Amino acid sequence: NSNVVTMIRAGSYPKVNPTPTWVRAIPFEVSVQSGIAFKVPVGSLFSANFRTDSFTSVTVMSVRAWTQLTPPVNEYSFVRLKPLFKTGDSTEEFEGRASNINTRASVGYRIPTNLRQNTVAADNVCEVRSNCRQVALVISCCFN
Amino acid sequence: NSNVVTMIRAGSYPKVNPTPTWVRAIPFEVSVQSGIAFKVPVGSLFSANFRTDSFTSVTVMSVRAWTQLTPPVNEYSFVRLKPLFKTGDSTEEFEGRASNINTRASVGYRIPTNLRQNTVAADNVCEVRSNCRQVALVISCCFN
Amino acid sequence: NSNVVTMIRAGSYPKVNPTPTWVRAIPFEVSVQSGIAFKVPVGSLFSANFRTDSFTSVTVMSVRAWTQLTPPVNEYSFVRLKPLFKTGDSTEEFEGRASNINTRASVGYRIPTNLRQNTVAADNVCEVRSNCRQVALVISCCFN
Amino acid sequence: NSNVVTMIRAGSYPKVNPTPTWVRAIPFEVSVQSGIAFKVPVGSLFSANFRTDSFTSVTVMSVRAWTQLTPPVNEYSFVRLKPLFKTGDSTEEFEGRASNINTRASVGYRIPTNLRQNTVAADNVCEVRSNCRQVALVISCCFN
Amino acid sequence: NSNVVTMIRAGSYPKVNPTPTWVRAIPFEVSVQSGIAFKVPVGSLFSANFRTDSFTSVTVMSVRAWTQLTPPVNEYSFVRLKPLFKTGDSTEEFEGRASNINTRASVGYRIPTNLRQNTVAADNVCEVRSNCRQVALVISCCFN
Amino acid sequence: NSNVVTMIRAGSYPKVNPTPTWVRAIPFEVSVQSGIAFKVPVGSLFSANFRTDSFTSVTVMSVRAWTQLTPPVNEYSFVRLKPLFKTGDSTEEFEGRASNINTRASVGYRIPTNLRQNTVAADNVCEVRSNCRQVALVISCCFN
Amino acid sequence: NSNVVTMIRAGSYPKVNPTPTWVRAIPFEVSVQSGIAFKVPVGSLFSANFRTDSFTSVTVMSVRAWTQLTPPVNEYSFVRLKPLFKTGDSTEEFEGRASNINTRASVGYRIPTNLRQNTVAADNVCEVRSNCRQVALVISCCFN
RNA sequence: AAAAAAAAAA
RNA sequence: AAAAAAAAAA
RNA sequence: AAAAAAAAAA
RNA sequence: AAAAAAAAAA
RNA sequence: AAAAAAAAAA
RNA sequence: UUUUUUUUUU
RNA sequence: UUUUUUUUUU
RNA sequence: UUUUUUUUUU
RNA sequence: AAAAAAAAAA
RNA sequence: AAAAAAAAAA
RNA sequence: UUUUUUUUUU
RNA sequence: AAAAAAAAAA
RNA sequence: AAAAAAAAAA
RNA sequence: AAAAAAAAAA
RNA sequence: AAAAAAAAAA
RNA sequence: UUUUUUUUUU
RNA sequence: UUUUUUUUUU
């Protein structure tokens, strides 16, 4: 392949965008209490730890949850997800349980195209329920 | 297609990365004096206006320049580019001229694979010469 | 086929959901006055008569209306539907008339994918106008 | 695809049903004592927690059991299932055992077509035996 | 072809709609100040000058902009667009610049299907920035 | 498909039209007396109830008529149409009768290409005769 | 398929057998001491708990062994099997060891066709050795 | 036959 | 790949 | 048509 | 060649 | 697609 | 993708 | 007979 | 190996 | 393989 | 040759 | 889906 | 698809 | 399958 | 024939 | 074309 | 022999 | 990709 700089025959000035969109998967954790549902805020996706402090809106595509800490004694890990939306919250409780006490419990859900609108920091993604004190999330989204 | 949320049978916790790389084309402008060469610093690529204030290094792939203002009276626009490298500056003067007085002049150059190392904010990209007082650049690079 | 019980060789604990979604066609009637449009509330879909008193939101896909009672003397039955949306009500008046005085008049409309968001009990499906005193509806939707 | 509402050319009033059937897999847990068989009541399937409080009968198709808590010390988890029927109870003890002490034990059985009749709340599904104090069940059935 | 009136063998009365939908491209201009962003109201699309004064909602599909006046002295024409949405404003700045000082600058963006909801007169389409005092807009939309 | 806004690489300013044409079918009713022909005015097609109050001319392609009320006692429904033209009125009497006393009568005619000129509000479409007091008309026309 | 009873045109009285053979895999456990071989008696296969109390002889085809309890501290589980025969005992010590301290150790041996004679309750099947205090056996055999 | 630099071409 | 329920389709 | 980044898939 | 609007058709 | 110069190659 | 100049490899 | 949702089997 | 986003080449 | 009765089906 | 139960197998 | 055992049908 | 009336055509 | 309206495309 | 939801399957 | 009942047949 | 108008058959 | 349940289209 080429070993030195080569000339580019550029033409007219193209169309540019200094602030483009970005498809990303954001990993973060949430602290949950026993028997209490925790509304996960959308504002947790806008942070300098994800290079996403420049955005103000995001389109969430899918949500995946993992238990982050060990379950109580004699129990297996479980994590539930209840989707939330601005036009109307859902009543599904997608639950995944671990079959080994030393293994995480995982579950997720996909958001259909008809409900993939923008969300801002004040909004909530879903509700999380678990017997472990911490839940890790991996949210596939498009920042715009 | 689907009209409601559907469960995702997630498995083990996957390999994640909260601060990934990003291939971009960064547009920005510089002020140039007549008969004086302007050194374009690499620090101009790290800004919040480009969503890039979180990176510290960047791999430049190609540089393109356009004249941003009108040329002096009776003249046609022109722009020269001299590539600069930490291992050793080059002496090429890639020059493009305008064939219409009302049209921009443009030129660009490609950096070969053997010279695509990282550069930090303190480094320089190239030298810019032009008869117009402002030059527009679009630098294709990989942030990491 | 099998005549007695057979053993299932199960494995790990699967991903479960106790409150799943449900695509339905909900029949119900509304009383209409002469020359006055009636806003059909979405809350009519959540009732124990439909096994749907557990849902809080619903995604309406298509609405079909029939005249339920006989028209006034010397007239043929008719029914008009005007779709309503939270992001902006429409002005279309889909209308159907009966060609026999003793037959029902019917009409319906389809909701596109871009407008298939969730609606709650406080929302309205559409406006209905009819010279008959009652109108039967069959609203294809997805409860979630 | 369409971006606005389109008219449906509906015809006569169709055959309707406001309370239809539903095939579901219902997850719930039962408390088991050591060396004592526990009868699983059919009434545990009718609940507002499963959106099935509107049904009174149910046709059971298959039953799957998992150990929900840890086994006693030094032991591996096990679970036994004995199908119960109104016309005549079976004596099969379908058993599954865990090969890892930290993993659930699971087993299941399928009800043939000749035994798929309706059952009410008073009826029993099966007897469960386990060295663990809790057993999670997932019953595939059709509500009607 | 036929040179006189011929009889149509019509049948039953069909499904009619007096106020139908309408796919349109609405051209109009806005006044922009130097260095000041201008929010384009959706109400600009409802006017008797476009035959659309009878509509109350509209679904936008794409937005296009051209510079309507000459840029300041020594400068090339440019125009920036930032899409706005009720669910969440975007941060993109789609920019197009003129390569000839006598030529307009043009740029545009397309709204995805998942963001094509209804918008009323009080809503805003996008922000516009330009060094020219007037920008010509052409908005492909569906009236309903 | 796309989930976020994407940039359109627009070019020169295109040919636009703010007040375009429109192919429509305009449904409306007229009051007819027994044994008296009624001239249908073209001005009935220009109204805000049809979104066509902005037009001043219209080109008719075909005319259809149904009886809107019940016929007198012991009689079957009928309707006659006589096309009218500015260059010369026709003498045809396209007639359709009901085979059931409870059913509407329908008939229609098509205007050839050589007679499809513009018509203003002062002009008349056709004469209508019927034993019923009201006749429903559906006129396929092109507004311009 | 047939929904009521049908007539069977039987012929002569067939050859019957009220006490037929039966191929089975008998699950049972034995208690084993440390460093002491345990002779598993054939009489353990004849029991009402396996529906085989009516048999007096059995033809053993294969023997499989699993550890039933946890091994000593710091040790992995293991189990040995030594086949025994009335015509002459074997000296093979088929051994299996667990590769996880929390998993069962398993091994098995198949009896060839030339050594598949009948064995009564007084006979032995194999000698079992293990560091666990219990071994779970599953013996494939034909009861006759 | 492919690859690099300088030049040329549709 | 076939079958059941709920929904949609030619 | 190939390659790079991010995402998604069998 | 495909997608959306209005009209028409088997 | 061919030709020249500098370089690399089977 | 090829022709030519410098160079290399085989 | 297929698309889609819940679920199961492989 | 393809689809999608950013970008370049042609 | 055809025919009859009763039932079910495209 | 297909269906069932029990066992076994790739 | 097959091999084996018990039984049935043809 | 053929025939009849009026018209038009190679 | 063809014709008209509005939108889009090579 | 394709798509959706609930279930079942290799 | 398949399935049920009664009848009939190789 | 076809196209068009009126009309009938299917 | 198919079978079943609700439903739609043809």
From Swiss-Prot, chains A, B, C, D, E, F, G:
Chief site of localization: virion
Key words of the record: Capsid protein, Virion
Compartments (UniProt record): Virion
Keyword Iron: no
InterPro entries assigned: Satellite_virus_coat_sf
Superkingdom of the source species: Viruses
Identification of the protein by name: Coat protein
Lineage: Viruses, Riboviria, Virtovirus, Tobacco virtovirus 1
